């Protein structure tokens, strides 16, 4: 008897056990194999890492050291893929991307 | 005596301290992150449930999660997520 939770055995930080419990209680299938929460936790951890790193870079080019939802909106809306995933998603207190159409500028 | 709420705010902070050691996060941004992880979880899990139901199978395996990631996520995002899931499953079934 011991240690070694399933996240540490898979080298992750997202909980494999909680994801397995949510997959079991979420009424998705009759059975859940014990590789599906590992894959699922890895995918969620990768997506969280990508969004958090892009938002940290957006905060870093803002002379700031704390991520606000504006930085998350700037991270998501500046990417083709990410915007596509979260294209029908509203972020609270995120604002919009700063853009003006070129015909509105004076000349 | 009221019951406790659970979220991803502890693990998301761990991933943040991996990818950015000297960078904090506000509570509103943590709420955005929790909603994001929940939304992607429901999307992938529902997609994989539909994949298992179409093929007359009764279990969700990592193959169903891989196909759901391929269907849901766009190109290079899906490629790197498949890479991460494959590496984690290979690492998990070795100990």
């Amino acid at each position: 008897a011991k240690a070694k939770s399933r996240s540490s055995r898979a080298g992750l930080q997202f909980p494999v056990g909680r994801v397995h419990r949510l997959l079991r209680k979420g009424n998705y299938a009759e059975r859940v194999g014990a590789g599906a929460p590992v894959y699922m936790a890895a995918v969620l951890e990768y997506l969280t890492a990508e969004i958090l790193e892009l938002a940290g870079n957006a905060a870093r080019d803002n002379k700031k050291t704390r991520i606000i939802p504006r930085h998350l909106q700037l991270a998501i809306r500046n990417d083709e893929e990410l915007n596509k995933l979260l294209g029908k998603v509203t972020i609270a207190q995120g604002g919009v991307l700063p853009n003006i159409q070129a015909v509105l500028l004076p000349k | 005596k009221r019951s406790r709420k659970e979220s991803y705010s502890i693990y998301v902070y761990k991933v943040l301290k991996q990818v950015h050691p000297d960078t904090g996060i506000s509570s509103k941004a943590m709420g955005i992150m929790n909603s994001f992880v929940n939304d992607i979880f429901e999307r992938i899990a529902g997609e994989a449930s539909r994949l298992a139901h179409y093929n007359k199978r009764s279990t969700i395996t990592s193959r169903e999660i891989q196909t759901a990631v391929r269907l849901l996520l766009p190109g290079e995002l899906a490629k790197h997520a498949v890479s991460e899931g494959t590496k984690a499953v290979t690492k998990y079934t070795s100990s």
């Epitope: 990508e50 083709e80 | 790197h80």
Partner: single-chain antibody, 226 residues
Framework: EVQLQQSGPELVEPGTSVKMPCKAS????????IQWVKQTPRQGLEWIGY????????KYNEKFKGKATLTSDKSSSTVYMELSSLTSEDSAVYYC?????????????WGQGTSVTVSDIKMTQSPSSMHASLGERVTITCKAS??????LSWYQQKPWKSPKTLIY???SLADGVPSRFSGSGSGQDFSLTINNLESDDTATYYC?????????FGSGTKLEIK
């Protein structure tokens, strides 16, 4: 499938400007950044900049700001580079390279390289050149200056040819690369291992970081067979 078409060699007198196109085909053009690097005999490969056609977002090297400008044409699926005020040390091979907006991804596909002829993290590679037989094991070290969280890539370049991507994310194999090449290491210490060689491994090998804002290439290791 993915092609990065370019122009021929441009002989240019000093003082004027020069244009280089990067007509791209085989993929969704707006979803991938186009990055420009230059190569000289004197100092090797160095990263000039990039242009993201999704929002036309540019980012240049600090030593190439003003010297080089980048534009994109979405209708023709082309990326244009302007170099202005060509001095004497501007005769170089200019490469454009596809790279996804994902941080893990690297310069996977390259252009042919336009030869222009005019009338920070330090990369330390310990072996400058080495010789090997037809079946032994080669190890190339790429100790870096600062900390990069596994954001290192390994490239193979034939003479008078575009560089070929071998390793991305410091351990992962590129598309079509066999399992003889193996990347290893993390943090500051990285290495590339060739398991058993062929006659096609006579090439120059480079390591590139993209963890920081200015991307820096390696010094280059020449590998000559028998």
């Amino acid at each position: 499938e993915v092609q990065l078409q370019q122009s021929g060699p441009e002989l240019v007198e000093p003082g004027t400007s020069v244009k280089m196109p990067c007509k791209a085909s085989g993929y969704t053009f707006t979803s991938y950044t186009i990055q420009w690097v230059k190569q000289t005999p004197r100092q090797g490969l160095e990263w000039i900049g990039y242009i993201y056609p999704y929002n036309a977002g540019t980012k240049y090297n600090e030593k190439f700001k003003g010297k080089a400008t980048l534009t994109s044409d979405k209708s023709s699926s082309t990326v244009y580079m302007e170099l202005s005020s060509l001095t004497s040390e501007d005769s170089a091979v200019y490469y454009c390279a596809r790279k996804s907006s994902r941080l893990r991804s690297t310069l996977d596909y390259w252009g042919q390289g336009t030869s222009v002829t005019v009338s920070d993290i330090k990369m330390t590679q310990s072996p400058s050149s080495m010789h090997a037989s037809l079946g032994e094991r080669v190890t190339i070290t790429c100790k870096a200056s600062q900390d990069i969280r596994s954001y290192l890539s390994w490239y193979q370049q034939k003479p008078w040819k575009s560089p070929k991507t071998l390793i991305y994310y410091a351990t992962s194999l590129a598309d079509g690369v066999p399992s003889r090449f193996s990347g290893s290491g993390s943090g500051q210490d990285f290495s590339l291992t060739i398991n058993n060689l062929e006659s096609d491994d006579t090439a120059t090998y480079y390591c590139l970081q993209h963890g920081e804002s200015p991307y820096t290439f390696g010094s280059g290791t020449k590998l000559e067979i028998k």
